[PDB]
């Protein structure tokens, strides 16, 4: 004597700008009854979707993305950058035995006071013409590499908030430039920013929030 | 009904713990050059003719 199916006021999710398709998907809410409606109550739900989906290309078949809902109008609600995380299976495949892992992170602030932390992971490359079955680093060299990753990472940010951050990650200049400064010290391969967590997002600023909506 | 006839090409062994089923690779005389392996029931030899019903569902090991 219920069945909330024939009651579910439906809705559609839209994607941000600096990507490909701004059309994400479909959802389920409720009848916008007075006092606790379907208005400002829910909204802020967040979606995990691979960006090989929302971009269409397949050279991005891991780098999963987390989008947070902010504003909603005219049977339509957008979303801003809220997360980027790698996939279990991908690293599970990345971490192969007989080599040195390297991990580092750092807390940082963008121009528009979006406070977050970014990560970094890389593996010593077995150079060709090599005999030794394993190839390990030299700790001190690992100190060095982590140091430079820290420098570079805290250099790329403090630049036009999410928008530009995503604009630096999507084409991965970070990876290739870490690769650039790296090869002087020690081989190293893969090299992925792997993960970045938001923790202290600023205020609403609805106007400036409409910065990726044409 | 699209029943398709396939001739035994080789006898591959007995599967199933009981040891009755026989692994055999066949080729249908309905457009040749298209080998598919099946598992029988009764006794068989080379160059017999099995009525394969479905034409894309082959098998291998039993238990």
């Amino acid at each position: 004597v219920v069945d909330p199916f024939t009651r579910k006021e439906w809705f559609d999710i839209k994607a941000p700008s600096t990507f490909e398709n701004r059309n994400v998907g479909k959802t389920l809410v409720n009848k916008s009854t007075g006092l606790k409606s379907a208005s400002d109550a829910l909204k802020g739900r967040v979606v995990e979707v691979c960006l090989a989906d929302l971009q269409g290309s397949e050279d991005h078949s891991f780098r999963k993305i987390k989008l947070r809902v902010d504003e909603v109008q005219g049977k339509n609600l957008l979303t801003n950058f809220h997360g980027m995380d790698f996939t279990t299976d991908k690293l599970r495949s990345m971490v192969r035995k007989w080599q040195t892992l390297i991990e580092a992170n750092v807390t940082v602030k963008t121009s528009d006071d979006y406070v977050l932390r970014i990560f970094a992971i890389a593996f010593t490359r077995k150079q060709a013409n090599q005999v030794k079955r394993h190839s390990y680093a030299q700790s001190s060299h690992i100190r060095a590499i982590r140091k430079v990753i820290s420098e570079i990472l805290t250099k790329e940010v403090q630049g036009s908030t999410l928008a530009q951050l995503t604009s630096k990650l999507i084409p991965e200049v970070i990876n290739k430039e870490i690769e650039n400064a790296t090869k002087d010290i020690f081989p190293l391969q893969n090299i992925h920013v792997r993960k970045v967590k938001l923790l202290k997002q600023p205020k609403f600023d609805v106007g400036a929030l409409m910065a990726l909506h044409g | 009904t699209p029943v398709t006839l396939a001739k035994v090409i080789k006898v591959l062994g007995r599967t199933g713990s009981r040891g009755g089923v026989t692994q055999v690779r066949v080729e249908f005389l309905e457009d040749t050059s298209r080998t598919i392996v099946r598992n029988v029931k009764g006794p068989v030899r080379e160059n017999d003719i099995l009525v394969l019903m479905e034409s894309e569902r082959e098998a291998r090991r039993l238990r």
């Binding site: 199916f5 579910k8 998907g25 479909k26 959802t27 739900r45 967040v46 979606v47 995990e48 279990t88 | -």
Partner: protein, 127 residues
């Protein structure tokens, strides 16, 4: 094309769970598990009931508002088995065959930078 959803198959031992929800998550849509489509305690994780519940799941799924769905399968994890269960893929089989689309799937098993001492004792679980 179709309409995206999330399947979420927590199918470790002893049971088998399926429920599509909103791609954001805060809006679930139909569930049902393996212990419902048979009763025997011992038969609560078997691939059969898994198939049956995958049926009862896809059924209401394509009968409310979603006709396609990405999945994320998960073992117990934490400080437990971490290895997938009996009706793990047995439910995956009967939700693609049941005429519903699939779109990239992964593993949300909660592997830790391990700790919180496991159950059992240093002497194991002898029997």
């Amino acid at each position: 094309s179709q309409v995206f959803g999330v399947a979420r198959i927590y199918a470790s031992f002893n049971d088998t769970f399926v429920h599509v929800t909103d791609l954001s998550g805060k809006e679930t849509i139909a569930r049902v598990t393996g212990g419902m489509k048979v009763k025997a305690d011992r038969d609560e994780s078997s691939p059969y009931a898994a198939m049956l519940a995958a049926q009862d799941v896809a059924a209401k799924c394509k009968e409310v508002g979603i006709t396609a769905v990405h999945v994320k399968i998960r073992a117990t994890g934490g400080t437990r088995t971490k290895t997938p269960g009996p009706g793990g893929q047995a439910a995956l089989r009967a939700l693609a065959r049941s005429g519903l689309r699939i779109g990239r799937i992964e593993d949300v098993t909660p592997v830790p930078s391990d700790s919180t001492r496991k159950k059992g004792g240093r002497r194991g679980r002898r029997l």
